[PDB]
Structure formats: structure tokens, C-alpha cells
């Protein structure tokens, strides 16, 4: 993560992130809509930060510091590169939409009026096909956990590496298995966030319809991922 984005999303809510004299200019319903939109980007930043810990710290650290057998590291972190590309691009678009919305002379005061279009783009077409295919490939979640458990309890260098990279307090809730479940659970958070954003987006009818469509798209994706899962065993 980059300091720029961590600061822009350090506050517990949009009403606390913006200047109080800017908050005072908006209707209550706008503040409620903006708080849920801020939570969507904030939790998307954390999810992308999780996938970066998996690729850069866990996976790459094991390739450069350990002599693990070929295919072992891949089995521990399946599709992490594909997942990191899918979500870093989606995060980039959410952050760009926020930036275009900033007031001149300000780096924190903004209002996102049009989010549904961005969500329809993400959960439709080729990008939706790639998320469905990458998340269906969850089928390797249990095997990754068993592989991790086997190595920790039988390998001295693997245990020393794990104890070393997970020692900082910033990785308290971000260990190997915590990372894997955080990624599996991410897709099922989207309907929750989108329905609460929609709950406060009846002001402009095109926005309510865009969000209604975007919600239907996420649920179709989740139903497809759920039907394509079958646990693999080693």
C-alpha cells in the first residue's frame, strides 16, 4: 500500500474523512450514501493490500529464501497473480473516480454521484468471465491450507520463514491462512455493500437502476462461482 491511499482512507467514515465545513454542505441522505461508497473503496484497498502480502511477501519470499519443491509454492497460493491483477485494476478505477470528484484545492473533499456504471463494467463482459473463472479455480482453498499445515509442522526453515515475515504487528490478522479466507470471503461482501449503497441512491433514478443492474450482475457471478466449486485433495 501507498501512504497516499492509506491516508485518504484512514478515517472510519466519509463524514470523518472530508473537512467538517464540506460535510455541513450536504443533505443527510448524501452523507449516508457516501459513507457506504467510502467503505466499498476502503475494504477494496485492504483486499488488494492482502493479495500484495500473498504475492510479494509470502509467495516471492518463499521463492527467494527457501528451496521448496517445484509446484509447492503454487499450491500454497493458487491464482494469486491473476487475482491481484483483477482487483488492482478495479481498485485503480474506484480511486480514479474519487480523484476526478475532488474539489479544486482539496485532496479529501469529494462526492461520488455515479458508481453503478463502474460496477456494471466490472461485473459484466470479459472482466466478469475472468473473475468467475479465477474464483472458481476456492476449489484449491482446502488443499492450500493442508499444504501450509503439513510444511509448518515438518519443515524448520518454513517455520522460521513464517515466524519471521509474520512477526510485525501489521500482519497480526494477515497470516497465510487468514489471507486465503479473506480472499474467499471477499466476493460475498459485494452484494452487502451494493444493496446498502442502493438503499441510499433513490435520488437520481438512473443511479438507482444502474445499481439494481450491478447488484443482479454480482449475484449471477456468485451463483456461477458457487456452482463451479469442488474441493481438490492431495
Amino acid at each position: 500500500s501507498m501512504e497516499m491511499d492509506e491516508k485518504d482512507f484512514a478515517a472510519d467514515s466519509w463524514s470523518l474523512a472530508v473537512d467538517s465545513s464540506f460535510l455541513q454542505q450536504h443533505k443527510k441522505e448524501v452523507m449516508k450514501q457516501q459513507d457506504v461508497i467510502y467503505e466499498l473503496i476502503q475494504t477494496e484497498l485492504h483486499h488488494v493490500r492482502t493479495l500484495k502480502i500473498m504475492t510479494r511477501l509470502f509467495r516471492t519470499g518463499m521463492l527467494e529464501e527457501l528451496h521448496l519443491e517445484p509446484g509447492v509454492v503454487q499450491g500454497l497460493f493458487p491464482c494469486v497473480d491473476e487475482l491481484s491483477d483483477i482487483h488492482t485494476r478495479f481498485l485503480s478505477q474506484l480511486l480514479e473516480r474519487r480523484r476526478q470528484a475532488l474539489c479544486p484545492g482539496s485532496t479529501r473533499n469529494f462526492v461520488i454521484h455515479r458508481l453503478g456504471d463502474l460496477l456494471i463494467s466490472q461485473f459484466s463482459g470479459p472482466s466478469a468471465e475472468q473473475m468467475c473463472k479465477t474464483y472458481s479455480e476456492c476449489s484449491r482453498h482446502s488443499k492450500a491450507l493442508k499444504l501450509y499445515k503439513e510444511l509448518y509442522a515438518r519443515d524448520k526453515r518454513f517455520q522460521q520463514f513464517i515466524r519471521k515475515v509474520t512477526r510485525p504487528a501489521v500482519l497480526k490478522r494477515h497470516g497465510v491462512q487468514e489471507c486465503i479466507l479473506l480472499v474467499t470471503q471477499r466476493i460475498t461482501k459485494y452484494p452487502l455493500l451494493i444493496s446498502r449503497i442502493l438503499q441510499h441512491s433513490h435520488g437520481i433514478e438512473e443511479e438507482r437502476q444502474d445499481l439494481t443492474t450491478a447488484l443482479g450482475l454480482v449475484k449471477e457471478l456468485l451463483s456461477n462461482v458457487d456452482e463451479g466449486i469442488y474441493q481438490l485433495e492431495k
Binding site: 472510519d12 476456492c138 479466507l181 479473506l182 474467499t184 452487502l192 458457487d226 466449486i229 469442488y230
Partner: protein, 179 residues
């Protein structure tokens, strides 16, 4: 410090996400109540023992029967939640949630938790429930259900007023510690 894993299960309106947030923040969010809970590692000390309790939610997974069980591996304690203002969520405990939790988490202790206990004496709640020939879940009904499903124990709490929240998580730590 020993690492233990807690998972909270139950219907969508049971209030499991609010319970996790109020516990992890140790405060009722005064400006914004978040929609989702990611995870949390709580530093708890119960009966002299220091434990790291990883907290997980299953909210958003209730409709996805192949995605949902991926939350279960290595679980040490199950929080089976139901809302006191919703007798129908309690009725779903033995026929939907209990068979699943005992298949994927055999011999794992289950604490049956009655959430939203402040609503038991709410004017709007009692009136709204009466329009469907129903009334808030009584304490004896929750205790009966926990016996019927072989729960480790039965507890009640109110995430809104923070009453009973600390005790549920200290008990859950104690259940995770038993072997």
C-alpha cells in the same frame, strides 16, 4: 498466547456482524456502523490464560452452500446466532444450521447466542410481532433450544447496548481451550 479460531453462524438478520464489530472496536460505533466485517485477532485473557482469538463472519455466504463451508476449517468455537426479535431465525437453528456445523466441525463446541436482547422489551417490536401471531423469544425457549441441539451453553447479549458482549467472547475462549 495460543491461537484459537471463532466463527459466527446464523441467519442474515441475526445481527452477527454488529456483534463482531462492537466486540472488536469495544465501543458502539457512534458515527458509522460498517456494513461488513473482514476479520480480527483479539487479545483475550480468560481465567488466567492468554489467547489470540481470530474472529470470522459468515455474512453474505448464507445463500452459497459451496462457498460457505470454506469458512469452517480449523474452527475452535462456533457462535450460533439468532435474533430475539425474530422467532423464525431460532426455528432455523436445528433444521438448517446445526446439521451443517456438526458435519464440518465435529466435536467443536457450539455456543447458542441470543442477540438483540434489548428488543425483548421494545414497544415497536412487540407490536410488529403481534401482527404475525408471534412474540419475542423467551429466555426459557433459547435455553430449551440449546439443550435440544447439544450446545456447550446458551447466552444472551445486546450489541446495541454492549450488554453481555464481553462475557460471550470470554466464554467462547474458554470453550475453544477445552480438549
Amino acid at each position: 498466547a495460543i491461537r484459537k479460531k471463532l466463527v459466527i453462524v446464523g441467519d442474515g438478520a441475526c445481527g452477527k456482524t454488529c456483534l463482531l464489530i462492537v466486540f472488536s472496536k469495544d465501543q458502539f460505533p457512534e458515527v458509522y456502523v460498517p456494513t461488513v466485517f473482514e476479520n480480527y485477532v483479539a487479545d483475550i485473557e480468560v481465567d488466567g490464560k492468554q489467547v489470540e482469538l481470530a474472529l470470522w463472519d459468515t455474512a453474505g455466504q448464507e445463500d452459497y452452500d459451496r462457498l460457505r463451508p470454506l469458512s469452517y476449517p480449523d474452527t475452535d468455537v462456533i457462535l450460533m446466532c439468532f435474533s430475539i426479535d425474530s422467532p423464525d431465525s431460532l426455528e432455523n437453528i436445528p433444521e438448517k444450521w446445526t446439521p451443517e456445523v456438526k458435519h464440518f466441525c465435529p466435536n467443536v463446541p457450539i455456543i447458542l447466542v441470543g442477540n438483540k436482547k434489548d428488543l425483548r422489551n421494545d414497544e415497536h417490536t412487540r407490536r410488529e410481532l403481534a401482527k404475525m401471531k408471534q412474540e419475542p423469544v423467551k429466555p426459557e425457549e433459547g435455553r430449551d433450544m440449546a439443550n435440544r441441539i447439544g450446545a456447550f451453553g446458551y447466552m444472551e447479549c445486546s450489541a446495541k447496548t454492549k450488554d453481555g458482549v464481553r462475557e460471550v467472547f470470554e466464554m467462547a475462549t474458554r470453550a475453544a481451550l477445552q480438549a
